[PDB]
Design a protein around this ligand. Structure first.
Ligand SMILES: Nc1ncnc2c1ncn2[C@@H]1O[C@H](COP(=O)(O)OP(=O)(O)OP(=O)(O)O)[C@@H](O)[C@H]1O
Ligand SMILES: Nc1ncnc2c1ncn2[C@@H]1O[C@H](COP(=O)(O)OP(=O)(O)OP(=O)(O)O)[C@@H](O)[C@H]1O
Lengths: 295, 108, 634, 597, 108, 191
């Protein structure tokens, strides 16, 4: 449960259900089950600057004396962690768990072939305002990413719950395929750093038991012309039990399809886990992939 | 401003008990009008109850009232200035010049 | 004494060890769930009300309240094993009592009734607000210790003394200011509601003193009923009448329920129980994943009317409704859907509006005359002597999701119609006559049952010739459902054989056996009866919010506009920017009943093929040509 | 106890972030220009201040002013006697429980409210430093009464060796503080089921009073203590708020910072303001270019001349919108309400038009007749908005005839006859006689008898219904993007950050640009409009001889000069020009033709 | 409360009888001196008060030298001392929300 | 559990309301008339067991008369008497009543001469049996009623001119006036 010392035990309620998305649900039991463990205290307006800053140490102790009796009985050990922290003398305590979270989102937002140039000049520029974030001189821009981060997850969870309830994940034979053909707010999927997080939420919806077919997914989305389709692959995950050597099989196959016909395929993006495709090529993409078993 | 509540020339017996045992006929609007001028607007856009008051103060210089108290003839030297508008737009020439507002001829 | 200590032990097991109706642990379900909301309430089940009453009725009427104070401290330890640590969180529970066998009203209160459980009705008149109550009197001596513990003060009796257990002098007991918790206290005076009353006479007055977690549950103006006790505490000082050996009554209430309707039941619909957890919610999902539901549901709504389809579909759509959806710093969007019925004097239009009034959760039935323009919306009732010009609502501000009626009060049509067609246009309307300039919120729904001057086809000439209304107030609605029949042999018996069988529809096992008789009598064709059907509506309006797609919406733009062109080139009354906002709305009302948040393709064509035919069929003789148009739309 | 005092005098002379030494660097700046006030800031005050508030939560009503005695003892260190005591102002922001949890766990804790303030009382006085005389024994003392439990924190005792209660209040050596009893009202949007809103009461101190006008959004932070008035059952008391600090939004008396006006001057040099606002004002309105320009000039206005004689001109404009239902004259009017500095919305049924302007009633104390209420006196400087000018015939016309054209009312009811000031600006949106027939007959039948209201307003739009087959499909393409998908909320946020202007930026610069510059038109324009009118009247004059009557008279000719003065307030130029004025008539020349057809 | 400056010990008395003798006290009223007492409320000059409020008012106690000089409706200009009187907080007990400091002007 | 009353009925002679002065005190006189403006149903006492909490408050005192808020006779032990009282709700039976006004019939009114009236207390099972609006008869015991001027907040005509003689009782000097009123026992409505 993150960014707590910065703020929001309120929007913890979403990403407490992320943690219950690691258990057995995404909404159903938890929206009852959370109401044993949370609204025990109504969460204030003024002393909540003091109660979930200071005397939540009475309650972190209380969770510390709640989850010790949720330890031999629940045994879900994704919560207690050793971690690390720093302080500045004043200006609040800021650990490094939440701190990497602000750097990701602030890298995202904070701003023929004529659109990709004006798209590529953006990401270099907004990179630059994150590099100078390591002084004391950035204070009132530090919280800017913080308040940015706790809506982006609320943005990304707004559509993740949609594509679940659409039920367009199909286990064909090997993987599962999902094509986000069109929804709302498609603009936040050009920059690929959000996509691994969307997969990071999506690899954990299928992180139940699943005692056969531990294979990650391949998604699809499009915002711009000529169906650019920044398709990507994920990694399978372990529920804290890596014994088997599971790195990736796709880049071996990514050499294959790129070697076939060169009919508007691109590997110009840097990381090999992301390529591009054409609209009329994604359907013969998978037919080349459902038979080429290279794992 | 010619807003025609009852009080344009009267008292309406407002005393406010004047510290427990004093009743006063408080001057509405004629103690200011004395040896001066007034002006009021919108004659036809009024009720009936002001028109009976402007009858008395024109035929007679004084008002005299006994509401819940004392009959008193207090004097007043007033001079009104009027302002009204015709009713049916620009209909003055194609009809009679008289009755063109048709407020009572008690005032005309 | 001490034997009541065993009594608390003896009842506790007598409560939780048993659950009626084939187990599934009912009393264990109420407790853990109203823990999860943290709201301090419990009930008494009806079938074991009486078996919990039979050996406890002689310990009800003998003492009703001290039995309850010892009844309460066992319910702490009832849940304490289940949920611990309800001590740092408000440390307090107190029980409530469900329905009770008693009919009587305010006219019948004797001296035999007092200090006992009573049930009575009425109408809530003008009330006060919320104050804090002391409730725990820390007494303060001057010389000795000024802390005597937080006491147990009474009701309005002002319990005090001169001197005890410190000294015997006249050093008065005073106050100080730490660690005295406060409950609230809201005195509603009550008038007898002029319903079941031998008429032609006056109302009668009482007093109700509410308690802590029962504050502002009712509103100033509905009808209610209370389940209080009958405490008669006063010193004997009274000042409207002279001093006498006389006492005054005070009803301290224990619970409260709302406006009830169709008082004919025997073992159900007396409490808004509304708890859908293990068996009900598991059931409500599997009733929602079927492939003919919205075809089955709208056939199952009006149980006793064999009429044509579309009027049932629209009146299904009206109480379901879409979304009062939010927007940024810009104009809001109407989240209401308002229908209008045009009919003949003699079809069943006056009954479907009656039937929906019961099946809705809240309603009002302002009909006919007396609908004054100030009377529907808010009014300003004048002050008493030391009071202020306050604001008292009328119909609409009560009815958030209900019903009015405007048919043809021809004289009083020009009076109030300038107050209801600005309730939809300038939605959430309020006003500032001679008082404060505020604006309340009222997202109300309108239905109506207008009546043409004579017959239904008073002309081949169009609707502006038929009704006496003009265009703009008519244009706020979504659809003008119109009826018709001249002569039909087979259709008439389909009513005539249908209607005569309805007139043929004129102890623990026996209370159950009457219910199965009451269940079978509605189940001649078994069209999913009203025992469960209304119960999922209330959370079909307060728990689910739909959303839309983009790729299927633009296919109807030409279907709108080319139908906008034929209706503008040939028109009686026109469609505008208004109607299309209803096109997308009554679409998503249907998909709201799949409980699914999405919009499909299967519904938009269904929603279109409701509107277009129901618009075009009201035109003229020249309707047979337009039916050759609409199958191209289909 | 004491010594808390030593924990804070040794705390506010050194709290800083990294080498700025802030609280001495503002108290020094605040003892100079006389204000005598503080604020507090962030977390460690919170970090250890809860460790002080874990001994201040028990009674944050008596040891809140134990702060107050401290900072005077650091004040005299920055002097070297005329030294007053100080006051405190706070800050905290997590959320706003509106009016729900108000008796259980919220007696004497710090609360935060969001409300709309409606009613101010007249000022008063309570003391804070007194001098006390025993009667026949002549003791002299002095007691200070700082914070409260309303009156009677402590009393005056019997000990001076003279008689009982011998104590009297001289007025020779005394100080005083003022209280308000202004009333607060719930913001009418947060708890809808079927209810009516409630109300509370509060007081304040002098160096934060008179900071609010009625009709604003506000937020407030303070205590929830309890008094007991003896002018109802058991001994029950009442609730009230003791406020501390209003960290409000803007006033909505022209003092502000400088970086606000820097961007404004950086925007006002780019000469694209007139066309860029029409897209950026109403992000939810398909076009309507002639109407949209009439609204931006209505919001700012012209001027006011008190020219060296007795009379005056009326510097304002007042528009009308009449037309068919379904042409967005309604929902456009809610849009001007939030963007205005001061706006009311009484748009329905007149609301007892005699009680629109004034009300008098009997009084609970002293049984008196004083002035209380009005819709106009609340709405000065800004804009009202009403509708339904067909089915009000009772008093709505007789109430606006005086209220408009001179803006100087005087009530002649049973008490006073006072000419209170008014500088209002009206707006209306009616219906004609079901729309189409007034556009398919002789052009009469608009108002039932009289046109005398119509001569009093200048600008009149008459919209209609076309059937152009390409403009509807775009509209049918428009509103589905704005209904669901909310994709234009992502589109207009994308053209916001370099090209368009959001709502909270438009409000702040209108009050700045109105309250600074004062235009005047150039005498080169005097030949221009004079040559314009003589054929405009003649175009009317050629129409009357064809037996076509109705209306144009000379108020409009002195209304165009306010219209051309309006965009001079927009450009903030102290003159007016010819490309200025030719576009102005281009709005009104367009509305002269529809006055005929 | 008329000496305008010094808050002396008041004499809560109307008229004494029987000074320290056995003589029935007689009072000479020709050599007893009198003075008058008149309060008047003053509104605000309603042009220079900016548009955010109704007119307010305070009051003034004057003496004989300029009584009957003040017709209601005169642009008057007074000057005097500012003065409080009355016991606020002790003359009744518990004294919650009651101002006890009346604004007065004892002027000339 | 046993509480009774005595209900006579059917005396021969029926009077009117204008014939009730001198011999009619403590008598039995049937009275006709019509009834208007009822009131509600409150309880009475007739017997209490209140006593002071000095030592023991279990003294069932006497004399629940028209000023009965002071049980102060014969305390239990040698304790402090008339120091308090505690009117419990747990042991003293009550009886329920209502106060109504009557009016003279229409076939007897001589002229339109402001037709006078009087009031009547009905106290047994007679409660809610006089429906307002009928020509009605009554039982007949006449009764006077004072006001004792209790501890409440207060203590044209020369009324109480009789009562100026009624000064100087052992409690405070005042004027206890009187007014003729009516107590009933049994209603009937022939008509
Ligand atoms: N199709 C039908 N099925 C069953 N009952 C019907 C039908 N049509 C009419 N009735 C009966 O006729 C009775 C007469 O009421 P009806 O509905 O005709 O009033 P109405 O004509 O609708 O009144 P209004 O014109 O005021 O709406 C109703 O009680 C209803 O039971
Ligand atoms: N020109 C336009 N541009 C954008 N939206 C419009 C336009 N005209 C109407 N609308 C839409 O119409 C919707 C509902 O407005 P509504 O139907 O209440 O107008 P109306 O009040 O009926 O018009 P009128 O005031 O003439 O009766 C609003 O959501 C608004 O967006």
């Amino acid at each position: 449960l993150f960014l707590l010392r910065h703020s929001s035990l309120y929007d913890s309620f979403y990403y407490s259900n992320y943690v219950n998305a690691k258990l057995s649900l995404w909404n159903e039991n938890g929206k009852k089950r959370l109401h044993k463990m949370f609204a025990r205290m109504g969460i204030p307006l003024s002393t909540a600057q003091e109660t979930w800053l200071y005397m939540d140490h009475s309650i972190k102790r209380e969770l510390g004396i709640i989850f010790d009796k949720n330890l031999d009985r629940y045994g879900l050990q994704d919560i207690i962690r050793d971690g690390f922290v720093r302080t500045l003398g004043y200006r609040g305590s800021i650990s490094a768990s939440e701190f990497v979270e602000a750097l990701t989102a602030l890298l995202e937002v904070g701003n023929s072939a004529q659109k990709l140039t004006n798209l590529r000049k953006r990401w270099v520029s907004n990179f630059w305002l994150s590099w100078d974030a390591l002084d004391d001189r950035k204070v009132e821009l530090l919280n800017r990413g913080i308040q940015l981060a706790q809506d982006l997850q609320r943005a990304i969870f707004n559509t993740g719950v949609a594509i679940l309830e659409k039920k367009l994940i199909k286990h064909l034979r090997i993987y599962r395929l999902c094509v986000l053909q069109d929804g709302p707010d498609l603009d936040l999927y050009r920059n690929p750093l959000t996509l691994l997080r969307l997969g990071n939420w999506l690899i954990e919806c299928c992180a139940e038991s699943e005692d056969k077919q531990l294979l990650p997914m391949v998604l699809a989305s499009i915002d711009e012309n000529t169906d650019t389709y920044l398709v990507a692959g994920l990694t399978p995950r372990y529920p804290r039990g890596t014994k088997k050597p599971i790195l990736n099989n796709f880049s071996m196959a990514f050499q294959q399809i790129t070697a076939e016909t060169d009919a508007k395929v691109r590997i110009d993006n840097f990381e090999s886990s992301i390529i591009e495709i054409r609209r009329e090529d994604l359907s013969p993409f998978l037919e080349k992939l459902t038979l080429s078993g290279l794992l | 401003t010619g807003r025609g509540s009852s009080g344009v020339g009267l008292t309406a017996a407002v005393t406010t008990d004047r510290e427990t045992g004093e009743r006063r006929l408080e001057a509405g609007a004629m103690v200011l009008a004395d040896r001066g001028v007034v002006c009021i607007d919108e004659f036809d856009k009024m009720t009936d109850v002001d028109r009976v008051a402007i009858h008395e103060v024109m035929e007679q210089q004084t008002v005299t009232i006994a509401k819940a108290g004392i009959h008193t003839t207090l004097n007043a030297r007033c001079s009104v200035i009027a302002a009204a508008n015709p009713v049916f737009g620009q209909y003055d020439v194609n009809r009679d010049p008289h009755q063109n507002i048709a407020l009572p001829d008690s005032l005309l | 004494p001490n034997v009541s200590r065993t009594i608390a032990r003896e009842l506790k097991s007598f409560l939780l060890e048993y659950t009626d109706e084939t187990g599934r642990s009912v009393y264990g379900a109420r407790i853990r769930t109203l823990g999860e909301m943290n709201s301090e309430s419990l009930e008494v089940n009806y079938r074991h009300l009486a078996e919990s009453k039979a050996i406890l009725a002689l310990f009800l009427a003998k003492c009703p309240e001290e039995m309850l104070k010892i009844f309460d401290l066992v319910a702490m330890e009832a849940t304490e094993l289940h949920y611990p640590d309800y001590a740092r969180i408000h440390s307090e529970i107190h029980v409530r009592i469900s329905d009770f066998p008693t009919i009587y009203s305010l006219r019948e209160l004797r001296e035999s009734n007092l200090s006992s459980l009573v049930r009575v009705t009425g109408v809530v008149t003008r009330r006060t607000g919320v104050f804090p109550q002391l409730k725990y009197v820390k007494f303060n001596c001057l010389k000795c210790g000024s802390i005597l513990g937080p006491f147990f003060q009474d009701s309005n009796e002002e319990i005090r003394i001169s001197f005890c257990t410190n000294c015997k002098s006249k050093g008065p007991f005073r106050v100080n200011g730490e660690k005295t918790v406060y409950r609230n206290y809201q005195r509603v005076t009550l008038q007898e509601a002029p319903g079941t009353v031998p008429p032609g006479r006056l109302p009668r007055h009482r007093e109700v003193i509410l308690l802590a977690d029962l504050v502002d549950v009712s509103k100033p103006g509905e009808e209610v009923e209370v389940t209080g006790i009958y405490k008669n505490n006063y010193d004997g000082n009274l000042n409207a009448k002279n001093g006498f050996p006389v006492f005054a009554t005070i009803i301290e209430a224990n619970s409260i329920k709302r406006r009830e309707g169709n008082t004919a039941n025997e073992g159900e619909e007396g409490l808004d129980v509304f708890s859908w957890t293990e068996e009900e919610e598991r059931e409500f999902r599997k009733i929602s994943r079927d492939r003919g539901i919205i075809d089955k549901i709208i056939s199952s709504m009006a149980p006793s009317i064999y009429g044509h389809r579309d009027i049932k579909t629209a009146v299904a759509c009206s109480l379901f409704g879409g979304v009062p959806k939010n927007v940024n710093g810009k104009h809001s969007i109407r989240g209401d859907i308002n229908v209008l019925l045009l009919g003949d004097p003699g079809t069943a239009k006056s009954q479907i509006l009656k039937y929906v009034e019961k099946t809705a959760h809240r309603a009002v039935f302002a009909t006919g005359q007396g609908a004054s323009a100030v009377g529907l919306t808010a009014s300003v009732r004048k002050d008493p002597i030391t009071k202020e010009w306050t604001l008292e609502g009328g119909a609409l501000v009560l009815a958030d999701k209900g019903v009015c009626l405007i048919d043809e009060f021809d004289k009083m049509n020009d009076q109030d119609r300038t107050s209801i067609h600005e309730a939809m246009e300038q939605q959430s309307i309020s006003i500032s006559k001679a008082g404060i300039v505020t604006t309340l919120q009222a997202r109300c729904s309108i239905i109506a049952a207008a009546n043409p001057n004579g017959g239904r086809y008073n002309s081949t000439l169009p609707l502006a010739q038929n009704v006496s209304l003009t265009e703009p107030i008519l244009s706020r609605f979504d659809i003008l459902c119109v009826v018709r029949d001249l002569v039909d042999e087979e259709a008439d018996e389909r009513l005539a054989t249908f209607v005569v069988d309805s007139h043929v529809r004129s102890q623990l096992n026996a209370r159950q056996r009457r219910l199965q008789r009451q269940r079978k009598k509605e189940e001649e064709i078994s069209p999913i009866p009203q025992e469960l059907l209304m119960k999922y509506i209330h959370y079909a309006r307060t728990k689910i919010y739909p959303k839309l797609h983009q790729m299927d919406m633009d296919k109807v733009s030409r279907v709108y506009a080319d139908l906008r062109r034929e209706s503008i080139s040939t028109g009686s009354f026109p469609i505008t920017v208004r109607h299309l906002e209803s096109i997308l709305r009554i679409a998503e009302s249907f998909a709201k009943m799949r409980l699914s948040e999405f919009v499909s393709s299967y519904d938009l064509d269904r929603a279109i093929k409701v509107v277009v035919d129901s618009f075009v069929d009201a035109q003229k003789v020249s309707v047979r040509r337009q039916l050759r148009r609409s199958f191209a739309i289909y | 106890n004491t010594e808390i005092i030593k924990s804070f005098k040794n705390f506010i002379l050194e709290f800083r972030l990294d080498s700025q030494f802030i609280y001495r660097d503002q108290l020094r700046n605040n003892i100079l220009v006389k204000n005598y006030s503080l604020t507090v800031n962030m977390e460690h005050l919170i970090g250890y201040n809860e460790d002080i508030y874990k001994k201040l939560s028990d009674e944050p009503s008596d040891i809140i002013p134990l702060f107050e005695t401290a900072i005077t003892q650091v004040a005299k260190r920055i002097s070297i006697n005329s030294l007053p005591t100080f006051q405190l102002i706070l800050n905290s922001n997590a959320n706003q429980i509106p009016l729900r949890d108000l008796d259980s766990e919220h007696v004497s804790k710090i609360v935060r409210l969001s409300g709309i303030i409606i009613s101010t009382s007249v000022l008063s006085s309570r003391a804070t430093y007194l001098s006390i005389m025993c009667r026949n024994c002549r003791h002299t003392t002095s007691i200070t009464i700082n914070n409260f439990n309303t009156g009677n924190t402590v009393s005056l005792p019997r000990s001076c060796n003279c008689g009982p209660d011998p104590y009297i209040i001289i007025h020779e050596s005394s100080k005083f503080i003022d209280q308000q009893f202004l009333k607060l009202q719930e913001i009418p949007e947060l708890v809808p089921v079927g209810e009516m809103p409630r109300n509370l009461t509060m007081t304040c101190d002098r160096y934060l009073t008179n900071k609010v006008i009625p009709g604003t959004r506000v937020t407030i932070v303070g205590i929830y203590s309890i008094y007991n008035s003896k002018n109802s059952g058991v001994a029950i008391r009442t609730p009230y708020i003791k406020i501390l600090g209003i960290q409000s939004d803007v006033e909505t008396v022209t003092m502000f910072t400088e970086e606000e006006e820097e961007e404004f001057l950086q925007l006002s040099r780019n000469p694209k303001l007139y066309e860029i606002l029409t897209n950026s004002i109403a992000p939810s309105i398909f076009g309507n270019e002639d109407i949209k320009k009439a609204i931006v000039c209505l919001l700012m206005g012209g001027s006011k001349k008190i020219l060296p004689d007795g009379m005056r001109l009326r510097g304002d404009i007042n528009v009308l919108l009449l037309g068919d239902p379904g042409t967005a004259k309604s929902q456009l009017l809610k849009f001007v309400e939030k963007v205005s500095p001061i706006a009311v919305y009484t748009s329905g049924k007149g609301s007892s038009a005699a009680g629109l302007t004034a009300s008098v009633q009997r009084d609970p104390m002293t049984r008196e007749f004083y002035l209380e209420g009005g819709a106009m006196v609340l709405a000065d400087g800004g804009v009202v908005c009403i509708d339904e000018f067909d089915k009000m015939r009772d008093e709505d016309r007789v109430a606006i005839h005086e209220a408009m054209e001179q803006q100087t009312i005087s009530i002649a009811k049973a008490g006073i006859t006072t000419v209170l000031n008014s500088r209002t600006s009206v707006l209306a949106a009616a219906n004609p006689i079901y729309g189409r027939y007034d556009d398919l007959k002789s052009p009469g039948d608009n108002i039932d008898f009289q046109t005398t209201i119509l001569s009093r307003f200048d600008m009149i739009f008459i919209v209609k219904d076309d059937h152009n087959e390409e403009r509807d499909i775009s509209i049918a393409n428009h509103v589905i993007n704005i209904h669901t998908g909310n994709a234009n909320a992502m589109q207009n946020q994308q053209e916001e950050n370099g090209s368009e202007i959001s709502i909270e930026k438009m409000k702040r610069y209108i009050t700045y640009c109105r309250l600074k510059c004062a235009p005047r038109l150039s005498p080169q324009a005097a030949e221009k409009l004079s040559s314009n009118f003589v054929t405009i009247r003649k175009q009317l004059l050629i129409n009357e001889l064809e037996s076509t009557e109705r209306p144009i008279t000379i108020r409009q000719l002195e209304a165009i000069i306010r219209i051309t003065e309006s965009l001079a307030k927009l450009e903030l130029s102290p003159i007016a020009q010819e490309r200025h004025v030719d576009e102005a008539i281009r709005l009104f020349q367009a509305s002269t033709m529809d006055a005929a057809s | 409360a008329t000496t305008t400056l010094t808050t002396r010990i008041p004499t809560p008395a109307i008229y004494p009888t029987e000074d320290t003798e056995g003589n029935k006290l007689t009072t000479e009223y020709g050599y007893s001196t009198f003075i008058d007492h008149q309060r008047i409320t003053v509104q605000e000059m309603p042009e220079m008060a900016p548009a955010g409020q109704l007119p307010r008012s305070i009051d003034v106690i004057l003496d004989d030298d300029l009584v009957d000089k003040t017709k209601p409706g005169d642009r008057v200009n007074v000057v005097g001392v500012f003065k409080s009187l009355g016991a606020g907080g002790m003359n009744q007990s518990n004294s919650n929300t009651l101002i006890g400091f009346k604004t007065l002007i004892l002027g000339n | 559990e046993r509480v009774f009353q005595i209900s006579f009925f059917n005396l021969p002679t029926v009077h009117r309301i204008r014939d009730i002065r001198s011999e009619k005190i403590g008598s039995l006189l049937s009275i006709s008339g019509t009834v208007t403006r009822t009131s509600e149903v409150r309880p009475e006492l007739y017997k209490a067991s209140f006593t002071c909490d000095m030592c023991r408050a279990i003294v069932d005192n006497v004399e629940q008369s028209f000023k009965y808020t002071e049980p102060t006779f014969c305390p239990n032990p040698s304790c402090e008497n008339r120091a308090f009282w505690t009117l419990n709700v747990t042991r003293s039976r009550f009886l329920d009543w209502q106060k109504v006004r009557i009016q003279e019939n229409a076939n007897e009114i001589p002229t339109g001469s402001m037709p006078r009236t009087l009031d009547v207390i009905l106290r047994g099972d007679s409660v809610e049996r006089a429906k307002p609006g009928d020509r009605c008869k009554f039982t007949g015991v006449e009764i006077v009623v004072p006001d004792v001027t209790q501890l409440g907040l207060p203590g044209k005509t020369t009324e109480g001119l009789n009562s100026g003689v009624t000064g100087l009782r052992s409690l405070g000097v005042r004027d206890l006036t009187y007014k003729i009123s009516f107590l009933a026992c049994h209603v009937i409505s022939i008509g």
